[PDB]
Design a protein around this ligand. Structure first.
Ligand SMILES: [Ca+2]
Ligand SMILES: [Ca+2]
Ligand SMILES: [Cl-]
Length: 667
């Protein structure tokens, strides 16, 4: 189980070499720094002012009750302790504590092999295999473009550092899987940087004076994910109605929603819902219309919505809304918050207001237990009691680092923990009203614990483009990285979101994205931030009939998806899966980024480029049947015709669901 051999030492854990240390090749450095943060409205620029970094070359080992205690030191005056133990469940527990609080930097090297791959670290959009690169772990806006060599990224960076880079995300997490078949989970929420660049070791940098790391091994990845999710959390089963069609993203009030619902339904589209983020009203800005950030039904913008929700529910249509953890400073909720001390504060003791351009929002202080209770009641009374079937629970990634919080923990530490705290507020609202498995909320931000508390992740803001780092393609590493970090329910905005700098959503992008989303567990559209510039679900008859066809595809898969979702809830086996979960012996499957398995038996490789008439993907060794033609294929690279509406989807001839899958092509 734990094999500690000892000047120099080695620690093996179920035969994986975890730590090696000598005077000449230490495993531990400590020191100190000052965080140098430029927030840029959530587009954080975060770097160190490094003061010291000192190698703790000397170690003295004692036997401990639980396991081992290593005293690391350098000279007479600098030291740290590392306790090594099994935890309650047999996980390897490493507990590091620096000599004093002033040494707020740790660098720890974990032994590795040059061939190892590494997956996880939350939701990663440019890399799935993380080997070869470093990953700062700091929740932020995800970036527009995300690649310093693309034009959109350069444009966004000219304005508020908004372009981002390959590691930017709203759901980074200090949790990874190695192909030595273990996971490592770090309890801290400070800034960290996980460096997977060096062939012989991983280096984990923490901006704290202490660290706690836990490891478990397993015989298979599937077992590993079961263990990881026993640690972090498992999601609920989705409500049954999620499988019944597309949720239409509509703004502009009750009657606009009505007309669009009818147009789609009368053309044969399977529609399970309407998601109207302007349920709370419309705020005019110099850049067009924004949602009004006060979380109560606005009967001026949505007349008769209370009775309309009932009528829609009678016809099999749920109503979904929107909430975030800020409150518009000129409206009711924020005044109430200001009166009861429910807002975060600034250094001078005033209520902290964040600028979102011309308008401001108070930051709800979720570490204040009365503010938390209060905001949960807002959810219960203003959304659940109104009859909402779900909502977007947006933001979480932008707790400013110069807030002062009720629990007295530094915002430098609370910033990364904010998303799962927000998620818990939502989850408890449902738990307390008996609505788990009936109401569905979806989030973009996350952190450790979102695995229990977020009932569905969405991929946040993609560009309305075909880029690798911020377009349709980027959703696939996002799903797969999350899957390997223990969250197995994931979807994206059908057609993407970010409509800036002359990017506008084509019909072709919308239809290709619809083809992708019909092979995921949830179908939901978005108008984008500039709705008039984008092609929408009702743009013409061909678009509408396309939605009719692919929503019929999606609804036909219902029982298969429902089985997959039940496995996710039961054992953390995610719905969209890396191919190596089922083809472990196939070396090629470890480096794939842009294809996945939907449950066990369907392989999907979404077309993510403009102007394609065919598509090339990889099949591992199995008996595959192309969904649309019934052509049989074996293992290897394959190129197939891929017109819109016939995405590159294959299923296993031997699946017990083969008769359901054979029926797809005659829809
Ligand atoms: Ca983006
Ligand atoms: Ca009116
Ligand atoms: Cl790929």
């Amino acid at each position: 189980l734990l094999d500690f051999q000892f000047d120099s030492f080695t620690l093996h854990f179920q035969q994986r070499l975890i730590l090696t240390h000598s005077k000449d090749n230490p495993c531990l450095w400590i020191g100190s720094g000052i965080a140098d943060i430029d927030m840029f409205r959530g587009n954080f620029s975060i770097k160190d002012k490094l003061q010291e970094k000192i190698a703790l070359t000397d170690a003295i080992v004692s036997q401990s009750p639980d396991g081992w205690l290593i005293h690391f030191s350098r000279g007479s005056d600098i030291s740290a302790t590392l306790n090594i133990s099994a935890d309650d469940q047999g996980r390897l527990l490493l507990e590091l504590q620096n000599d004093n609080l002033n040494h707020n930097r740790i660098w720890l090297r974990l032994a590795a092999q040059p061939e190892d791959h590494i997956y996880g670290c939350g939701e990663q959009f440019s890399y799935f295999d993380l080997r070869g690169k470093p990953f700062p772990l700091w929740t932020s806006e995800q970036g527009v473009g995300r690649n310093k060599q693309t034009y959109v990224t350069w444009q966004a960076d000219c304005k508020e550092n908004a372009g981002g880079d390959y590691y930017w995300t709203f759901f980074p997490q200090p949790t990874f899987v190695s192909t030595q078949k273990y996971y490592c989970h770090v309890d801290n929420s400070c800034y960290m940087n996980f460096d997977f660049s060096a062939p012989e070791y991983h280096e984990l940098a923490l901006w704290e004076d202490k660290a706690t790391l836990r490891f478990e091994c397993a015989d298979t990845y599937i077992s590993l994910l079961e263990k990881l999710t026993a640690l972090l959390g498992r999601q609920p089963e989705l409500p049954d109605w999620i499988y019944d069609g597309v949720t239409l993203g509509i703004q502009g009030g009750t009657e606009v929603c009505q007309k669009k619902l009818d147009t789609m339904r009368n053309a044969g589209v399977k529609v399970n819902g309407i998601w109207a983020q302007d349920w709370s009203g419309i705020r005019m800005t110099s850049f067009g219309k924004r949602v009004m950030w006060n979380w109560k039904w606005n009967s001026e913008n949505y007349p008769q919505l209370d009775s309309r929700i009932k009528q829609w529910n009678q016809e099999g249509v749920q109503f979904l809304a929107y909430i975030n953890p800020y409150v518009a400073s000129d409206k009711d909720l924020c005044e109430e918050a200001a009166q009861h001390g429910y807002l975060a504060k600034d250094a001078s003791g005033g209520d902290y207001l964040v600028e979102f351009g011309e308008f401001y929002g108070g930051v709800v202080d979720l570490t204040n237990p009365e503010a938390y209770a209060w905001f949960k009641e807002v959810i219960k009374k203003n959304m659940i009691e109104l009859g909402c079937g779900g909502w977007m629970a947006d933001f979480g990634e932008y707790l400013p680092t110069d807030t002062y919080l009720h629990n007295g923990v530094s915002a430098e530490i609370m910033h990364n923990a904010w998303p799962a705290l927000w998620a818990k507020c939502n989850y408890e609202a449902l738990e307390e009203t008996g609505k788990l498995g009936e109401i569905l909320f979806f989030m973009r931000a996350g952190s450790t614990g979102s695995q229990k508390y977020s009932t569905m992740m969405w991929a946040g803001d993609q560009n309305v483009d075909w880029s690798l780092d911020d377009g349709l393609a980027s959703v696939v590493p996002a799903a797969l990285s999350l899957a390997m970090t223990g969250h197995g329910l994931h979807h994206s905005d059908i057609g993407g979101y970010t409509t800036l700098f002359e990017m506008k959503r084509s019909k072709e992008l919308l239809l290709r994205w619809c083809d992708f989303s019909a092979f995921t567990p949830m179908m939901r559209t978005h108008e984008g931030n500039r709705p008039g510039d984008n092609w929408q679900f009702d743009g013409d008859a061909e678009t509408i009939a396309h939605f009719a066809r692919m929503t019929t595809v999606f609804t036909t898969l219902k029982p298969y998806l429902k089985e997959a979702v039940a496995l996710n809830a039961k054992s953390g086996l995610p719905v969209m899966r890396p191919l190596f979960l089922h083809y472990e012996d196939d070396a090629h499957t470890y480096t794939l980024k842009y294809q996945y398995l939907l449950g066990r038996d369907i392989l999907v490789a979404p077309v993510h480029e403009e102007g394609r008439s065919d598509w090339t993907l990889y099949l591992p060794e199995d008996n595959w049947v192309h969904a649309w033609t019934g052509e049989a294929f074996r293992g290897g690279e394959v190129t197939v015709n891929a017109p819109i509406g016939k995405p590159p989807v294959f299923y296993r001839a031997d699946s017990e669901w083969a008769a359901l899958f054979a029926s797809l092509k005659s829809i």
